[PDB]
Amino acid sequence: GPAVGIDLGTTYSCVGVFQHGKVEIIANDQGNRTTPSYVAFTDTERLIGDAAKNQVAMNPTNTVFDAKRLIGRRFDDAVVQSDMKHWPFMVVNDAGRPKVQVEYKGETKSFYPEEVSSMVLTKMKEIAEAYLGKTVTNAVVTVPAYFNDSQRQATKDAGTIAGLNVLRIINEPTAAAIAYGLDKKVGAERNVLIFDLGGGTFDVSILTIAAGIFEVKSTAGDTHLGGEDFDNRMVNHFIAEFKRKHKKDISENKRAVRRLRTACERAKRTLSSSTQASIEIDSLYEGIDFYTSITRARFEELNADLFRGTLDPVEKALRDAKLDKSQIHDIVLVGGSTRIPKIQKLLQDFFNGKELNKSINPDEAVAYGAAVQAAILSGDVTPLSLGIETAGGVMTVLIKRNTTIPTKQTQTFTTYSDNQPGVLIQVYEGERAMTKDNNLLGKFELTGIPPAPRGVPQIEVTFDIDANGILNVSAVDKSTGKENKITITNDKGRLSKEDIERMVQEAEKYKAEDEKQRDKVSSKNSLESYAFNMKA
């Protein structure tokens, strides 16, 4: 059977399959193309998805949601402690690990976060088996790009507990970019911005894509921004309008607030396609009908700070990627809140009128991409940065990865110590800040340097890659013309695509440590006479 793509989301999940040249997003038993990531425990039974979310107001302490915010984390994590305060269900500490604790069939029960997510995955797996008429065992599951190794491993465990063989865990922004065919471009590298406003979180990611390989350059966002915050601004507006018109505060009455909030969500969706929405609630409070309206402009005004606030993580991400906004080749809109026209207009104005990729249903695009990647797994540029070791074992890059071949790059270096008789040129490949974490390709010495104080002798190092892919590295003492050279072969099958992806992933994992190492370094043009990695 074909492998499925599963967007395991904070508030909802979505499953899709690539069949007959086309992705189909699979509707569940209620006919819905997404399924809430909720699990409810009752005296009679366990409910998953739509049934769970429907009865939440009736059974809030035994209805679990937001398990993705706990997955992979320790109880003591500051995120977990802050998030606990807002949840009606109990989270307890079992040997350093959080568990949700609920009453089920009269018995107190506790579940790890991955157990809860595995129940969501079982429901997704069942939804797909009903659609396909056959068992589903293979799946691609997505996670946020900022998930660390423990969160990724805990997501795979949930898939295993559910009986899925997880082919690969891939990042949500990568899924989205695959959905839009940005990997199939086959040309010079492209910078892609993924703008993901939905499922209770706001994530901005910048990716580079070249030769079928994705690298996450930077991520920013807000973990507690979503559509409910926009709806809440409307709710408080209408509570105030009711208090002003009828001198009554409906905040006392839980159901009244619930009815208003439901009306406000509906109006928000209307305002994405019309310039005004009608609110009609019979007997909202003390028998008073609440018939009114709201314009798109008022809704935008009510949310002005939240809407304009989404550009601050965009600016942050661009800074961390060391990119200007003009250097972004592709903008991709993911998440249900990106249907809001003011959001789209703010983003487009920020990018000087650049057209946005948004034709794929923004609620489904991540599942769309996972489904395509699952199908692939079922069935000329430099791959890695090139440089030499400078003083202290620092990787100093002469040719960034994704550089077009042929190419020639030269840089000038000096000596680290006084009267240094020679320098050791050590060629490395990789994306880490220290040579010890990259791959040594070759080394040669340039000796005969005339005695001089530190920093005086000038050594020019040249990296040349011809059309055949052979790398020639040479060094010249600029005071004498004496030189030395090494040739480095690039046979087919030296690096597999998997080897490249591994190197890229390690770079994304240690991006924090390495970027602070690049701030920490003082001189990146000094060369020593010994290999730093062989020094005791």
Ligand SMILES: c1ccc2[nH]ncc2c1
């Ligand atoms: C040797 C090692 C790495 C390389 N990258 N591109 C050409 C090449 C040659």
Ligand SMILES: [K+]
């Ligand atoms: K996901």
Ligand SMILES: [K+]
């Ligand atoms: K999001």
